[PDB]
Amino acid sequence: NWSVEDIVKGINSNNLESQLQATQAARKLLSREKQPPIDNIIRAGLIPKFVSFLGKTDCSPIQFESAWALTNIASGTSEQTKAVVDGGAIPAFISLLASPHAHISEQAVWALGNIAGDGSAFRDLVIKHGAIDPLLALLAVPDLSTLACGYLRNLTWTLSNLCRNKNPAPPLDAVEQILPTLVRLLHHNDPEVLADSCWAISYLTDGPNERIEMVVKKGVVPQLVKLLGATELPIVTPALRAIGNIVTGTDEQTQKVIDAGALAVFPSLLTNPKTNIQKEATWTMSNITAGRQDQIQQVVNHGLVPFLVGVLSKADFKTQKEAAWAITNYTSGGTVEQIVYLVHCGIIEPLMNLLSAKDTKIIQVILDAISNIFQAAEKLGETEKLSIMIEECGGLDKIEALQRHENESVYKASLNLIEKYFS
Amino acid sequence: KRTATPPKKKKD
């Protein structure tokens, strides 16, 4: 449990072994659990010394200790990672990546992962120094099983961070250089490797449809669905996020998701005990019901409309908001037959009960959905029956009360409905 | 249509 001053005295000596001991003391000090002294170590000016030690090919232990210490420093605030980067650590770690000693290279992977995880700028800087080539060279083996578990996990997490963050998104050339190894890692059996790969794919699918197309062309959607059916939540969460991001794009990408068999999993996702899983699944359903009428009909065929009715009847308010969005998209883009089927599944009562809330946006969404349903009824000449139904459930009172809402669109919609169909 | 693993991690 050395002091900062003792570590400084040791590192400033002209003895390689004394420097090694002081660097190990620094590592152990920065490895503590309760408030490691990162800021005090930075103020002592020890980062350049560790960076210099990184290059002592003749003394592997000092390389390892300085790498560990710099890793733990770069794991903190953006300012501390900036200190590490300003010390010149990126090229030294990239050089260490090719060390004959495996633990040194693993520590280099770890440090570069932290630096890239800082944000977009440091990610692009790590990429510019040329880390992707040696990193992927570490994984260029016939069978990933020959590599050590921790080594592979750290490599996967570092790559996931190299795929992470937006504004700007990762350079396209780097994504193309990384994607094959990411696909090979997405087929590995270790749960942590799988979760990190799914998070990387999630990051890469968040953005314009061209990035989504990059990912989908690699043919990873079936594996993403398979993992969506996984038992480990750490795997299902990123897989569900990736599938949702994929279906936020073109109708053909959403259709590739559907062909993979994703809908079959949603009965359990829309009833999943974890609120976030339910919310993400309902949002995915909302973006699927905004697609083609063929895709709406595929939502119907899989028996997912009753599950949406259920979510609308009882769920977290945010999941209920996503469900109202899904219903309004369904009604806007659906056939008269599909809107009728939706009514027969019992949407009117829950959708009305949700008009007594205090969120103006959902009130507008619901009134728009009801306008669409009334339009379909007019198409079939059943406007009066729908009116009787919205009455018996106690909705008419809700609409006539919304007529007195501060918002203008709520006022207009409530009135319009009352006067057109209820008078 | 409309629109996590720790970024940084310490050793020990």
Residue numbers in the entry:
A (entry chain A): 75 to 497
B (entry chain C): 124 to 126, 138 to 146
What does the paper say about this structure?
In the best characterized pathway, importin (IMP) α bridges cargoes bearing basic, classical nuclear localization signals (cNLSs) to IMPβ1, which mediates transport through the nuclear pore complex. IMPα recognizes three types of cNLSs via two binding sites: the major binding site accommodates monopartite cNLSs, the minor binding site recognizes atypical cNLSs, while bipartite cNLSs simultaneously interact with both major and minor sites. We combined bioinformatic, biochemical, functional, and structural approaches to study this phenomenon, using polyomaviruses (PyVs) large tumor antigens (LTAs) as a model. We addressed this possibility by x‐ray crystallography, and solved the structures of putative bipartite cNLS peptides of MWPyV, STLPyV, WUPyV, KIPyV, and MCPyV LTAs bound to IMPα2ΔIBB.
Strikingly, all other tested cNLS peptides bound as bipartite cNLSs (NLSbip), occupying both the minor and major binding sites of IMPα2ΔIBB with their upstream and downstream basic clusters, respectively. For all bipartite cNLSs, the IMPα2ΔIBB P2 major site pocket is occupied by a K residue, forming hydrogen bonds with IMPα2ΔIBB residues and a salt bridge with D192, whereas the P2’ minor site pocket is occupied by an R residue, forming hydrogen bonds with IMPα2ΔIBB residues and a salt bridge with E396. Similar results were obtained for GFP‐WUPyV LTA NLSbip, which localized to the nucleus to higher levels than GFP‐WUPyV LTA NLSct and the derivative GFP‐WUPyV LTA NLSbip_m, bearing the K124A/R125A/R126A substitutions. Conversely, a duplication event involving an ancestral monopartite cNLS (red arrow) would have generated two closely located cNLSs, capable of binding IMPα either autonomously at the major binding site, or as a bipartite cNLS at the major and minor binding sites simultaneously. Such a scenario is exemplified by MWPyV and WUPyV LTAs, whose two cNLSs are still functional independent of each other, but together act as a bipartite cNLS. Furthermore, all tested HPyV LTA cNLSs exhibited IMPα isoform specificity, with those from WUPyV and JCPyV binding preferentially to IMPα1ΔIBB, and that from KIPyV binding preferentially to IMPα7ΔIBB.
